[PDB]
Amino acid sequence: RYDEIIFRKLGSMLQTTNILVTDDQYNIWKKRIEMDLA
Amino acid sequence: SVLAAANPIYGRYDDLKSPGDNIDFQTTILSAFDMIFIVKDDHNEERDISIANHVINIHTGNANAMQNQQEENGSEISIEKMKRYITYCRLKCAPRLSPQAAEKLSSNFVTIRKQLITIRQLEAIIRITESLAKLELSPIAQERHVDEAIRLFQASTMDATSLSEIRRFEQELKRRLPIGWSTSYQTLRREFVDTHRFSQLALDKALYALEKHETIQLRHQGQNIYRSGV
Amino acid sequence: PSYKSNIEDNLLSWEQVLPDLDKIMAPVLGQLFKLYREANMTINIYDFYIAFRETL
């Protein structure tokens, strides 16, 4: 990734904060649980 | 036959010095021994861990069973049987060199002499291959013994057109590194060898020669390289 | 901020800032800072110029 790195270096508020789980990680968790749910 | 274990003066053999300066006795003694081994014990992480593992295995008493099993496997010889074998080899066979072994010895010694050790060293090396042929009880000495003899000679005596490429690397490093500057082995690798300005063998040989020629000094096992002079 | 450290990193880690010679050669300032880090306390400037020329 390039945009996130330069945003972090620039100290921009546009960069997301890693306090909550990332969208991709939670999406993968939801899909893996749901695939065996039914 | 004399096997002499000598402690270099100043306690630790300094690599910045010629072997003559790390020694206190008559210089002609260096012309008496066939080989000298300046063994070094530079600190290392994994090698020390392996050595510690071996020593703990020895103190545990597992080494006895391991040696017994190795002897049963034929991978290790009993000391009494080894002595009997040595006596039998000494009493029976007496090999002699072959023309193929002599010519390679002459060529390699010519290269070593041109790079620089006296003519006595070439004749002394013959003892190693004769000894190996005696070990194998072969009727003649062989070049396949000469390879290991040369490797041991190189790793013993040298403890302290490719030459044109090596010297070109030396010139390019003298231009690249001003006096008093510092660099690293990996940096030189990336900037000269990965760019294919020079080969890795040329890199190693040029660094070795420049260190002997007091131009550069190797520090911290190659992590730091400092130019000590012209 | 680590004002000093940020500048040093940008000089050494220009890939964290920048996104046909442009594809090969880094900006001159950072490549010269590399030698500056390799440099001694006092420098004969002619030797420094020679080394910089050799790196080009």
Curated annotation (Swiss-Prot), chain A:
Record-annotated disulphide pairs: none
* The organism's place on the tree of life at top rank: Eukaryota
**Where does it live in the cell?**
Nucleus
Report the family membership: Belongs to the ORC6 family.
Q: What else is on record for this protein?
A: Present with 2970 molecules/cell in log phase SD medium.
Subunit info here reads: Component of the origin recognition complex (ORC) composed of at least ORC1, ORC2, ORC3, ORC4, ORC5 and ORC6. Interacts with ORC3, ORC5 and TAH11.
- Role this protein plays: Component of the origin recognition complex (ORC) that binds origins of replication. It has a role in both chromosomal replication and mating type transcriptional silencing. Binds to the ARS consensus sequence (ACS) of origins of replication.
Q: What is this protein called?
A: Origin recognition complex subunit 6
Q: Which organism is it from?
A: Saccharomyces cerevisiae (strain ATCC 204508 / S288c)
Part of the whole protein covered: 393 to 430 of 435
Swiss-Prot record, chain B:
Report the record's Gene Ontology biological process terms: DNA replication initiation; double-strand break repair via break-induced replication; heterochromatin formation; nuclear DNA replication; pre-replicative complex assembly involved in nuclear cell cycle DNA replication; premeiotic DNA replication; regulation of DNA-templated DNA replication initiation; subtelomeric heterochromatin formation
Name any GO cellular component annotation: cytoplasm
**Keyword Nucleotide-binding recorded:** yes
Q: Which GO terms describe its molecular function?
A: ATP binding; ATP hydrolysis activity; chromatin binding; DNA replication origin binding; helicase activity
Top-rank taxon of the source lineage equals Eukaryota
Q: Where is this motif: Arginine finger?
A: 31-34
Question: Subcellular localization, per the record?
Answer: Nucleus
Q: What is its main location?
A: nucleus
- Keywords in alphabetical order, please: ATP-binding, Cell cycle, DNA replication, DNA-binding, Helicase, Hydrolase, Nucleotide-binding, Nucleus
- What protein family does this chain belong to? Belongs to the MCM family.
- Which proteins does it associate with, and in what oligomeric form? Component of the MCM2-7 complex. The complex forms a toroidal hexameric ring with the proposed subunit order MCM2-MCM6-MCM4-MCM7-MCM3-MCM5; loaded onto DNA, forms a head-head double hexamer. Interacts with CSM1.
The miscellaneous remark of the record is: Present with 10300 molecules/cell in log phase SD medium.
- What's this protein's function? Acts as a component of the MCM2-7 complex (MCM complex) which is the putative replicative helicase essential for 'once per cell cycle' DNA replication initiation and elongation in eukaryotic cells. The active ATPase sites in the MCM2-7 ring are formed through the interaction surfaces of two neighboring subunits such that a critical structure of a conserved arginine finger motif is provided in trans relative to the ATP-binding site of the Walker A box of the adjacent subunit.
Q: What is this protein called?
A: Minichromosome maintenance protein 5
> Shown portion of the whole protein?
518 to 775 of 775
Curated annotation (Swiss-Prot), chain C:
Q: Which organism is it from?
A: Saccharomyces cerevisiae (strain ATCC 204508 / S288c)
**Function, please?**
Component of the origin recognition complex (ORC) that binds origins of replication. It has a role in both chromosomal replication and mating type transcriptional silencing. Binds to the ARS consensus sequence (ACS) of origins of replication.
Q: Which family does it belong to?
A: Belongs to the ORC3 family.
Q: Which cysteines are joined by disulfide bonds?
A: none
Spell out the subunit comment.
Answer: Component of the origin recognition complex (ORC) composed of at least ORC1, ORC2, ORC3, ORC4, ORC5 and ORC6. Interacts with ORC6.
Q: Where in the cell is it found?
A: Nucleus
Q: Which domain of life is it from?
A: Eukaryota
User: What name is this protein filed under?
Assistant: Origin recognition complex subunit 3
